[PDB]
Write a protein that binds this ligand. Structure first.
Ligand code: NA
Length: 304
C-alpha cells in the first residue's frame, strides 16, 4: 500500500504483515469504505494506523490518537467497538523496536485489564465474531456473519495465521514475563542469569490496591499526605533498584499506579515510567507516557 511508510513514520513503530493483509481484506469486503467494512455486521471500526492507510490524515500527535484511558504505551489501538464500554483492540509490543507480540483488547469504561485476543488481527476479529454470533437472533445477520467468518478463516488459512486466542509464541512470551501488573498483560524486561533487571515490589497486588484505595478515599489533604507514605517509600526503593540496574521494578510500580487510574497518581507515574522506559532504551514509550499523562482524556480521536 502506498501509505505504508507513512504509517510507520507517523507512529514511529513497525507494523506486522497481518496489519497490511487485513487492510486489503477489508478493502475487498467494502472498497467504498474499508475501515467501516465490519461496522454493520460486527459493530467494529478500523482506527489508529488504519486511519493513515485510509488517508484520513490528509497539531497531530499519533502517540495520543485513539489512545484510551487505560492504554499503556505498549498498546496501540487498531479497532474500536461498542462505545458504551469503550471496547477496543490494539497491538501489544513489549518494545518499540519489536513487532507486536499479540492483539490485546480492553473495555476502558469497565477496567484496566488487557485480554489477549490472538497474535494477529485476523484471529482477533474471528474470535470477536465467534463471540458476537452467540448473541444474534436474526437469521439474515446470522447468515452474514457466517459468510464473513468463512472469508476470515480462508484468508487466515491462506496466509498461515493461527486463529487461536493464545498461540505458542504467546505462551512462550509468558515465560519471559517478570510480573503481570494490574492490567494482567505482563511486563517483559531483560533479566540476566543473576536475576539482574528486575526485583519485586514489597507489597502484593492486592495490598498495593489497598494502599491506592486509601489515598483516593482520604478525607483530607493531610490524611492523603500520610496515605502516600508507603508510595514515597517504594519510590526510594526504586531509586536503589535503578542504581543496581533492576529497572523493571520502577516500571511495575509506575504501571500499577497508572492502571489504578486516579489522577492522584499522575505525578508519581510521571516520575517512574519515563525514567524506566529510558533506562530500558524504550525511548518511544517514555514519550508516549509523558504525553498521555499530560492529556489523559476519555475522548481521543486526533482527527476530530
Ligand atoms: Na504489580
Amino acid at each position: 500500500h502506498h501509505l505504508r511508510k507513512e504509517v510507520e513514520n507517523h507512529y514511529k513503530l513497525s507494523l506486522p504483515e497481518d496489519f497490511y493483509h487485513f487492510w486489503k481484506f477489508c478493502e475487498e469486503l467494502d472498497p467504498e469504505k474499508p475501515s467501516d467494512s465490519l461496522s454493520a455486521s460486527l459493530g467494529l471500526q478500523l482506527v489508529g494506523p488504519y486511519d493513515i492507510l485510509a488517508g484520513k490524515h490528509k497539531g497531530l500527535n499519533f502517540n495520543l490518537h485513539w489512545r484510551f484511558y487505560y492504554d499503556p504505551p505498549e498498546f496501540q489501538t487498531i479497532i474500536i467497538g461498542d462505545n458504551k464500554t469503550q471496547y477496543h483492540m490494539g497491538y501489544f509490543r513489549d518494545s518499540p523496536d519489536e513487532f507486536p507480540v499479540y492483539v490485546g483488547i480492553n473495555e476502558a469504561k469497565k477496567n484496566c485489564i488487557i485480554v489477549p485476543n490472538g497474535d494477529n488481527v485476523f484471529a482477533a476479529v474471528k474470535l470477536f465474531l465467534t463471540k458476537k454470533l452467540k448473541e444474534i437472533t436474526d437469521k439474515k445477520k446470522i447468515n452474514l456473519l457466517k459468510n464473513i467468518d468463512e472469508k476470515l478463516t480462508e484468508a487466515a488459512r491462506e496466509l498461515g495465521y493461527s486463529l487461536e486466542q493464545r498461540t505458542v509464541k504467546m505462551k512462550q512470551r509468558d515465560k519471559k514475563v517478570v510480573t503481570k501488573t494490574f492490567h494482567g498483560a505482563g511486563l517483559v524486561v531483560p533479566v540476566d542469569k543473576n536475576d539482574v533487571g528486575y526485583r519485586e515490589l514489597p507489597e502484593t497486588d492486592a495490598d498495593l490496591k489497598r494502599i491506592c484505595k486509601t489515598i483516593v478515599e482520604a478525607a483530607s489533604d493531610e490524611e492523603r499526605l500520610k496515605a502516600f507514605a508507603p508510595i514515597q517509600e517504594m519510590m526510594t526503593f526504586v531509586q536503589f533498584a535503578n542504581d543496581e540496574c533492576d529497572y523493571g521494578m520502577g516500571l511495575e510500580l509506575g504501571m500499577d499506579l497508572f492502571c489504578y487510574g486516579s489522577h492522584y497518581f499522575h505525578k508519581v507515574a510521571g516520575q517512574l515510567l519515563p525514567l524506566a522506559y529510558n533506562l530500558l532504551k524504550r525511548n518511544l514509550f517514555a514519550e508516549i507516557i509523558e504525553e498521555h499523562l499530560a492529556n489523559r482524556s476519555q475522548e481521543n480521536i486526533d482527527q476530530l
